[PDB]
Amino acid sequence: XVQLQESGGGLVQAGDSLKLSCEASGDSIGTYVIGWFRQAPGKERIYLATIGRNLVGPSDFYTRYADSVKGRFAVSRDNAKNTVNLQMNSLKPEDTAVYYCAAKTTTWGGNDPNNWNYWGQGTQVTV
Numbered sequence: 001x002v003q004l005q006e007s008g009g010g011l012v013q014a015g016d017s018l019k020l021s022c023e024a025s026g027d028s029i030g031t032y033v034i035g036w037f038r039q040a041p042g043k044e045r046i047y048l049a050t051i052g053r054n055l056v057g058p059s060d061f062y063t064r065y066a067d068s069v070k071g072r073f074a075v076s077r078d079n080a081k082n083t084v085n086l087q088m089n090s091l092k093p094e095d096t097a098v099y100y101c102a103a104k105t106t107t108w109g110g111n112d113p114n115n116w117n118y119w120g121q122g123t124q125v126t127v
């Protein structure tokens with residue numbers, strides 16, 4: 001079990017970038033696959049990206065992005081600081097929503113929010 005907390009959100013100007021952070025407590029974030037989601041008022045949480053626990057090469061961790069943000073958002077992992085980040089670029093009014101980070105240990109089902117075990121409270125992002 002791990003507790004997650006997002007930070008770095010808030011009012012942002014369209015065209016600019018924003019770096020969101022997800023900090024873990026109670027356990028090592030390195031033991032969990034971390035995912036990012038976003039939710040518009042009244043809608044469901046939609047999958048954004050995944051960063052795996054392990055590598056796919058000498059330096060890179062496994063990563064995956066929804067087509068909606070592939071190439072525009074970048075997920076990264078900093079286990080030493082028990083944190084995982086999400087660099088969001090060229091933000092626009094369409095990106096306004098509460099962003100969440102979640103965790104699980106499985107290697108499948110990232111798209112469905114119901115497959116994730118723990119969630120942060122979320123951070124509002126307004127552009």
Ligand SMILES: Nc1nc(N)nc(Nc2cc(S(=O)(=O)O)cc3cc(S(=O)(=O)O)c(/N=N/c4ccccc4S(=O)(=O)O)c(O)c23)n1
Binds near residue numbers: 055
């Ligand atoms: N090293 C390695 N090599 C290959 N081929 N694949 C992996 N996959 C993976 C390794 C690890 S890890 O812990 O070692 O880092 C985590 C993973 C987490 C998820 S997710 O469901 O949470 O998004 C995942 N989903 N994929 C998909 C989900 C939906 C559609 C397509 C994929 S795909 O397999 O990438 O193509 C993985 O495959 C993972 N890892």
